[PDB]
């Protein structure tokens, strides 16, 4: 019968402020210490704001001091965030919970969360490059090397693999370096008789390039 | 999360000596503290578990003690089989956590190795877009400081290339270094000669790879 309905969540532009609500019900609702936490693409959890039992305190993660505010309503079961001046750091799933960072649970609690409220803020993309993957072949039995260059995407990171996976001895994949244009390059490459392709999968802009190297 | 912080973090010992380990969590963790061994190319195992109890068929060597904050590690009379890397790991709050690893190596085994040394030319696809990319790779050499002079018509380069270097490997516990020279389609066009010179010490003198486009 324990249930934390979360609601609010939307696409907002940057700068501008976005809502959050939080029903509660199955429990004392004016006996526990209320929590927002949230989990963005690629990032752990993150508790962002807590506020006690009866409303007095308000600790916020440096992370949103100063634009979010959470307040409760201890006569209609209800917990509320305010995000204010909403940047692209923002964009990620909310939750509403009774279980702070530091509550020792061995197990994932936001498992107990459901599906949570979902704040995406817009202008995200703009900036996003997909590569270009180029073969890396000498000017004309295991003693050769061949590569890929993955050059001018952005952001980070970009994975590779060979032959889908198969080839793994002899793979040296480089860590990427940042170009003067501000894009980003990486290199890999392999240390016969069998062919070899190199699998670059960038995901913030969803590239997968199986480039085969002659 | 809590943060496991292990000492030291690299360990050159010979066959037969005694080695200790230790791991400091950021908050008390009792005894939901266990080691786990790690070798080349395979996951890693669980030897120790409860800061103390044996999994079954872990030799007597090996030793685990502390509880709630410091644990420590201990191997007696070290193997063959037990030069790897050790990890604590903490399963009492979530998320679970590892410490930084512990390279335990053999003493004889960090010798000079020479780099093979392989140039790449600018793929005809890239030159078709202003832009022209050479490459050249330093392949499994020790020590790490290495030297990469580029040279066109025999003209030094500077300002227009860019290193990366690979960690250490973990099987053979060697080093690889990429060079890429960036040029423009014309400046790649009024050039004939394009060399890699790498200064290493396993080399008696540099060792030049160069192609004529």
């Known amino acids: 019968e324990v249930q934390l309905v979360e609601s609010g969540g939307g696409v907002v532009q940057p700068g501008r402020s976005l809502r959050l609500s939080c029903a509660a019900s199955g429990f004392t609702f004016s006996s526990y210490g209320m929590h927002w936490v949230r989990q963005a693409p690629g990032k752990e959890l993150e508790w962002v704001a807590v506020?006690?039992?009866?409303?007095?305190?308000?600790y916020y993660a440096d992370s949103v001091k100063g634009r979010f505010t959470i307040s409760r309503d201890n006569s209609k079961n209800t917990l509320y965030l305010q995000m204010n001046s909403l940047r692209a750091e923002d964009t990620a799933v909310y939750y509403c919970a009774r279980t702070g960072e530091y509550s020792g649970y061995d197990t994932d609690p936001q498992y107990s969360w459901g599906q949570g409220t979902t704040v995406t803020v817009s202008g995200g993309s703009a900036s996003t490059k997909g590569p270009s993957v180029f073969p890396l072949a000498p000017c004309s039995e295991s003693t050769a090397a061949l590569g890929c260059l993955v050059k001018d995407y952005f952001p980070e990171p970009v994975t590779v693999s060979w032959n889908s996976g198969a080839l793994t001895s002899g793979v040296h994949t480089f860590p990427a370096v940042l170009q003067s244009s501000g894009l980003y390059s990486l290199s890999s490459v392999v240390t016969g008789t069998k062919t070899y392709t190199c699998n670059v999968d960038h995901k913030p802009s969803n590239t997968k390039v199986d480039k085969r190297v002659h | 999360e809590i943060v496991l912080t292990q000492s030291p973090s690299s360990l050159s010992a010979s066959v037969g000596d005694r080695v200790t380990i230790t791991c400091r969590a950021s908050q008390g963790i009792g005894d939901d503290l266990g080691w786990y061994q790690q070798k080349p190319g395979k996951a890693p195992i669980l030897l120790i578990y409860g800061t103390s109890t044996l999994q079954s068929g872990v030799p007597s060597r090996f030793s685990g003690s502390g509880s709630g904050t410091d644990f420590t590690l201990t191997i007696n009379s070290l193997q063959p089989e037990d030069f790897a890397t050790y990890y604590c790991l903490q399963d009492s709050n979530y998320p679970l956590t590892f410490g930084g690893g512990t390279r335990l190596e053999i003493k004889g085994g960090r010798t000079v190795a020479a780099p093979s040394v392989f140039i790449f030319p600018p793929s005809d696809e890239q030159l078709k877009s202003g832009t022209a990319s050479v490459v050249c790779l330093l392949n499994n050499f020790y020590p790490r400081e290495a030297k990469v002079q580029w040279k066109v018509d025999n003209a030094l380069q500077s300002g227009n290339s860019q290193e990366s270097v690979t960690e250490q490997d973990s099987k053979d516990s060697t080093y690889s270094l990429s060079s890429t020279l960036t040029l423009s389609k014309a400046d790649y066009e009024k050039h004939k000669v394009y060399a890699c010179e790498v200064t290493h010490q396993g080399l008696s003198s540099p060792v030049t790879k160069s192609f004529n486009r």
């Open positions: 506020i006690s039992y009866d409303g007095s305190i308000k």
